[PDB]
């Protein structure tokens, strides 16, 4: 991984990447149940408390959970496969549960108070539309959910930028998806064969169109 990002565990998705996920910006993983998407969230947990030599930040964690996505567990398994402590990972990850898409705005609005006493590096949203999708229903809501998420991801960007975080969220396909103004980096995944995963990057703007298997393994992924 390059300078300043955060390796994800797989040489060959960094490389699609450029080096791996930035800092002061949004990368959107979309993929169904199955794809990788949340595998690869508790992964970069892991490898942004690594130093930089290792392809991590020596940083901290929020984890922005709506709907039950983290599990303790597997941070714990990938921590100690890739030889740290455990217990230490997981006291690095601050995990918050969104129960409704105000709630899911108001903790990344309040989450720069505990940045100055520690140091983040990253922000897991996992998974950025599910509230927003279940609360604006038909026609006559959609435009309010897409101006909704939008003003959320301009905050989500202001944070990124002032805190120097990268930013990493979740995402599946319906073109309720897309949204007018690009926000983040896409990057589609989906399931494979034999522990194999897929991730595509087609409308990068500073990126070529790419793709790149990886493995799901007890190190979280990897090639």
């Known amino acids: 991984a390059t300078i300043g990002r955060i390796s994800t565990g797989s040489k060959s998705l960094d490389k ?9 910006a949004i990368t959107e993983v979309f993929g169904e149940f199955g794809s990788g998407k949340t ?14 030599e290792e392809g991590g930040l020596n940083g901290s964690v929020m984890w922005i959970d709506t709907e039950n996505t983290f599990r ?3 941070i714990r398994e990938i921590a100690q496969n890739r030889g740290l402590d455990p217990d230490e990972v997981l006291k690095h990850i601050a ?13 990344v609005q309040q989450a720069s108070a505990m940045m100055k006493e520690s140091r983040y ?6 998974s950025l539309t599910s509230h927003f999708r279940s609360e604006y229903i038909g026609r006559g809501a959609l435009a309010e959910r897409q101006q909704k998420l939008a003003k959320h991801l301009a905050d989500l960007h202001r944070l990124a930028n002032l805190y ?19 926000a983040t980096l896409r990057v589609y995944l989906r399931k494979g064969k034999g522990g194999k995963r897929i991730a595509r990057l ?11 298997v990886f493995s799901i393994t007890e190190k979280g992924i990897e090639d």
């Open 39 to 52: 595998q690869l969230a508790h992964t970069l947990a892991v490898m942004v408390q690594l130093p930089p």
């Open 202 to 212: 087609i409308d990068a703007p500073h990126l070529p169109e790419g793709e790149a």
């Open 72 to 74: 303790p567990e597997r």
């Open 121 to 126: 590096a990253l922000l897991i949203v996992d």
């Open 164 to 182: 120097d975080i990268a930013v990493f969220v979740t995402n599946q396909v319906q073109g309720g998806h897309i949204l007018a103004h690009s």
């Open 95 to 107: 995990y918050a549960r969104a129960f409704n898409s105000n709630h899911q705005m108001l903790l």
């Open 16 to 24: 699609l990447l450029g080096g791996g996920i930035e800092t002061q």
